[PDB]
Ligand binder design. Structure first.
Ligand code: CE3
Length: 263
């Protein structure tokens, strides 16, 4: 059985030609609205939130960890390194790496976060530690974005990622200082204007992390503070049947617009 919300999302999905996954959590009453909420989707860059959060968790017991400089070698650079390329034969702190990964989608920066955690398995272990039983990170950048049909690697479900993003940004999966830091990073994201943000009232404060990959995979996860009501968490995942499909950030904006109706 479906609600009008789910029917609108299904119609959007059909018109888009792809596969859409949505999870909304309204913290006013802890209700969820889901569309393909328990299907796996390739996370691509939305996985950078889990890696940054894992390092924040480490820093709760290692207080200067975020300010630890990490060497950036020429050999570290991968396919998209807008911030890290400014620091080749130099350093970035774990805070700077987190900001670059989250706010500029820097893939080299993500690889340093992954390395700090001991590899993709370290990121997954953090996910399990905060109660996310679904998330899995298997690969480093750039191959974690291959988004191959049927491939379980580097996937999660909309429901799981929404629950986790809520716990990280509004709940207490992290310490208070670290939660605030993650919120600050997400709020300052530079890559999200055309995605969930484009489908929501401009007066709402939004923190988000985008992701993109092959199969026209177009993703965004967001924490949302509407004017005068409890915050929301929204995950919108989208992927398409053919490997070189075009990005569709408009589909994410449309999904957000549908979800926002009545709120
Ligand atoms: C093998 O890797 N292939 C990638 C890829 O690097 N995806 C990563 C990902 O997510 N990224 C983000 C991200 O984390 O959102 C953005 C966003 O950056 C900007 C400026 O908005 C830039 S691409 C990078 C890819 C991307 S699209 C396609 N067919 N493939």
């Amino acid at each position: 059985q479906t609600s009008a919300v789910q029917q609108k999302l299904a119609a959007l999905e059909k018109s888009s030609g792809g596969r859409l996954g949505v999870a909304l959590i309204d913290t006013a009453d802890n209700t969820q609205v889901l569309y393909r909420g328990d299907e796996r989707f390739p996370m691509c860059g939305t996985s950078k939130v889990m890696a940054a959060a894992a390092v924040l968790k480490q820093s709760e017991t290692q207080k200067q960890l975020l300010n630890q400089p990490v060497e950036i070698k020429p050999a570290d650079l991968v396919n998209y390194n807008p911030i890290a390329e400014k620091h080749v034969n130099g350093t970035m702190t774990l805070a700077e790496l987190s900001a670059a990964a989250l706010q500029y989608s820097d893939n080299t920066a993500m690889n340093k976060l992954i390395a700090q955690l001991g590899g993709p398995g370290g990121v997954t272990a953090f996910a399990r530690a905060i109660g996310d039983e679904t998330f899995r990170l298997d690969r480093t950048e750039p191959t974690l974005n291959t988004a191959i049909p049927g491939d379980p690697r580097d996937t999660t479900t909309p429901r799981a990622m929404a629950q986790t993003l809520r716990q990280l940004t509004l709940g207490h999966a992290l310490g208070e200082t670290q939660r605030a830091q993650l919120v600050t990073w997400l709020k300052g994201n530079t890559t999200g204007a055309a995605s969930i943000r484009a489908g929501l009232p401009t007066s709402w404060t939004v923190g988000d992390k985008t992701g993109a990959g092959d199969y026209g995979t177009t993703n965004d996860i967001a924490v949302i503070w509407p004017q005068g009501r409890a915050p929301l968490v929204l995950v919108t995942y989208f992927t398409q049947p053919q490997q070189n499909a075009e990005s569709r950030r408009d589909v994410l904006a449309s999904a957000a617009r549908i979800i926002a109706e009545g709120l």
